[PDB]
């Protein structure tokens, strides 16, 4: 609920380059500046003779908002012989996937084709580049001697990638073994130490890889998507991967052990061709330190009040439990054909309430297919089924839909304000947007009405002026505030009180405030973080019995407190926001004595 949508950071790339198809954060391992990594897989490069080789850009944060390409590889196609290229980098879609662990940056070209040494072929084995510091090495685990559809010739390695917490690379290629798909995991230490540019198929030791299986599993697309998380409690991150065509298009999600690639758990979709497994994510959403699985099925069709199927998408949320089971719940989209669930981005603890949160993208929702991103906050029971915020894209295109939200990445506090921030990509408009998280003010309010029971015959107060003999009672509203992170010490609240609120317009109001002789009383206040309960009292009174013949319904004292947000800003320009989960209104009710 606390993301700043009024003035987000906006980055642009070359038109038609799909700038924003992939997004990530960059955290150089020197506590240095932070950057944004943005993939532009159709961008033209200076590589000799290469058309739309693609590139990955590093973007400054708020220093200039400038992006510059990262030089992973400045060369063209190697030659097996004169006029006989060894590889084909044009339209290789370099940057279709980008992942960054501390210094390391991993970017891949899932449509890189390579000839072979035996015969003139064009096989999309895919390739990746890993840059640590000055060191940059090529990582093409599927560029083996296992040539063809039957082998890994069409593996498209790098289609999806991730880093484990122990500096292992998780990579997926959906084309291996007649599109059964494949997962491969290699130690970054191996990837760099064993690199030899003279060797096209590098023998990495300690490599983990799924194996070819029976033909019944063909065309399953294992490795279409990947995520990492521990699911046997041994501290070793395990491999989650979507398999969207498995189970005769019901879709599946495989989990393999991150130590030996042994199969651990399986998920299966519920509807044909829902693309169950298009996206997967792993993050502990309920604070039990057990990673929870999120699975997207952006084509899942719901049933409507009229009984009509409507394609809205669906996300499954599977809470891991110590017993090894999973506690699953579904989450349906809101707009037809919006493809809710195409992207699922762990956000860390966005509102810093103690539970991790998550963003789910409907890249083709909103007005004119401008895309929508939903924010879901976590809690002890699981994920809050109602989104606490809705992010909309402001940009429209004319060739391919903006796809705002097609890619996302959160869980990084780029402005060091104490709250994680979110990157949203929109490759259809060659745009990438950074949303910064505003600090959250938890507010403790209180309202006391004494005496509670009121006797009209009782009269121990006097009205303003010479008027006398009115029944009265006291009201004492209180307010207290605190917060986490970069916040000012002083806060200017606006409180309002209303007596006999429940009576609708055109109905007599029995209670009035003493001074104002009106049922409403406004008030500006000022409180500091962690400060004491700042209170204030005033007196209210009842009208004469002759003016109202309703002595049955109770009299509610309503209190509403609002905060002028602009005054409590920060050097960032980032205003705080009131905790949306604590209601900003409280009410106590008094009663009329009867005899």
């Amino acid at each position, epitope marked *: 609920f606390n993301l700043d949508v009024d003035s987000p950071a906006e980055y642009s790339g070359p038109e038609g380059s799909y700038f924003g198809f992939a997004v990530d954060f960059f955290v150089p391992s020197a506590s240095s500046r932070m950057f944004l990594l943005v993939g532009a897989p159709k961008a033209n490069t200076t590589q000799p003779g290469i058309v739309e080789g693609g590139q990955v850009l590093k973007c400054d944060w708020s220093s200039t908002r400038r992006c510059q390409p990262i030089e992973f590889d400045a060369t063209g196609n190697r030659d097996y012989a004169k006029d006989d290229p060894l590889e084909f980098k044009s339209h290789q879609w370099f940057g279709a996937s980008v992942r960054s662990k501390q210094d390391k940056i991993l970017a891949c070209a899932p449509l890189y084709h390579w000839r072979t040494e035996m015969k003139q072929e064009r096989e999309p084995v895919g390739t990746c580049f890993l840059q640590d510091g000055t060191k940059t090495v090529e990582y093409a685990p599927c560029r083996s001697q*296992d040539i063809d559809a*039957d082998g890994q010739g069409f593996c498209q390695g790098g289609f999806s990638i991730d880093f484990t917490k122990a500096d292992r690379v998780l990579l997926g290629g959906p084309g291996s073994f007649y599109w059964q798909g494949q997962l491969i995991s290699d130690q970054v230490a191996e990837i760099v130490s064993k690199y030899d540019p*003279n060797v096209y198929s590098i023998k990495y*030791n300690n*490599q983990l890889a799924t194996r*070819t299986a029976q033909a019944i599993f063909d065309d399953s697309y294992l490795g279409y998507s990947v995520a990492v998380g521990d699911f046997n409690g041994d501290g070793i991150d395990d491999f989650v991967s979507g398999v969207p065509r498995a189970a005769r298009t019901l879709g599946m999600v495989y989990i393999y052990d991150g130590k030996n690639m042994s199969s651990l758990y399986n998920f299966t979709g519920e509807q044909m061709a829902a693309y169950f497994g298009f996206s997967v994510a792993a993050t502990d959403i309920n604070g039990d330190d057990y990673a929870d699985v999120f699975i997207g099925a952006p084509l899942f069709m719901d049933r409507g009040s009229d009984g009509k199927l409507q394609e809205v998408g669906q996300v499954s949320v599977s809470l891991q439990r110590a017993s090894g089971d999973f506690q699953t719940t579904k989450l349906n989209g809101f707009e037809v054909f919006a493809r809710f669930g195409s992207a699922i981005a762990p956000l860390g603890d966005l509102d810093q309430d103690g539970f991790n949160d998550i963003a789910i993208a409907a890249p083709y929702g909103g007005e004119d297919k401008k895309g929508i991103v939903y924010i879901f906050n976590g809690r002890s029971t699981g994920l809050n089924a109602v989104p606490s915020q809705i992010l909309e894209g402001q940009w429209a295109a004319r060739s391919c839909p903006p796809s705002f939200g097609y890619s996302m990445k959160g869980a990084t506090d780029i402005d060091k304000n104490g709250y994680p921030d979110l990157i949203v990509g929109a490759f259809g408009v060659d745009r990438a947007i950074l949303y910064r998280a505003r600090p959250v003010i938890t507010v403790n309010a209180g309202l006391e009405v004494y005496p509670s029971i009121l006797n009209q015959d009782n009269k121990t107060c006097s009205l303003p002026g010479t008027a006398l003999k009115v029944s009265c009672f006291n009201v004492r509203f209180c307010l207290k505030a605190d917060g986490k992170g970069v916040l000012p010490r002083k806060l200017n609240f606006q409180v309002e009180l209303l007596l006999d609120k429940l009576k609708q317009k055109g109905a007599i109001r029995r209670a009035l405030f003493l001074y104002s002789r009106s049922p409403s009383h406004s008030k500006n206040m000022t409180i500091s973080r962690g400060g004491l309960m700042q209170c204030e009292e005033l007196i209210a009174y009842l009208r004469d019995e002759s003016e109202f013949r309703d002595k049955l319904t109770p009299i509610t004292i309503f209190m509403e407190y609002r905060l002028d947000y602009r005054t409590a800003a920060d050097t960032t320009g980032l205003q705080p926001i009131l905790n949306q989960f604590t209601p900003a209104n409280i009410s106590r009710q008094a009663h009329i004595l009867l005899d």
Partner: antibody
Amino acid sequence: QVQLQQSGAELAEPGASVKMSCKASGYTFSSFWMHWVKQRPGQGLEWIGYINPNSGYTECNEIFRDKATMTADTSSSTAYMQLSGLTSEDSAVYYCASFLGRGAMDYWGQGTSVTVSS
Amino acid sequence: DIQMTQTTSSLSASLGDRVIISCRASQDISNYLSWYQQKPDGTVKLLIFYTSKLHSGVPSRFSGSGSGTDYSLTISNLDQEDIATYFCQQGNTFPYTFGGGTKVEMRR
């Protein structure tokens, strides 16, 4: 840390057959071809053929087309070669060598000696 | 088939000497020539591939050169563990063929 461990010495009578193994470790066995080489006592090296372990496809030197048959067990990362219709000319040391690429063989087993006598 | 011939079947050298082994092919093999070391116990190691590329782990002393049909291995600063037989092998076309082998013996 790539290692190719070959089986022990084989003895066989004329006309019989032998089957030798070559277990690989230190790399992904399925992703690289396995070559086989013959070396007669005091002689040079003779290339028999190669096998694609994951697919079973093989290519042989025309000499050994009817002599040798190559197989592979992926689950155990083991390559096998069987020599049939044995003679005295088949008595030799037989190496297995992983395929580096670039028309070279980067890692070699210790060799399996085969002796054919009555 | 490509015929690989190592003219000198044996040569003698002393410690520290520079040893150059020759190898000729019957056809242009487009630099796809490798060099192997075989020690008296049967152990075989790859030294050079693609005519000049050191395999991982072999010392810098070994180096390769050549093109077309003529190729040569070079051992600078010969070590005691270098006494062995050295084979060349073309990899440009099947079947892979080896040279007769050159044997390096210590001088005395």
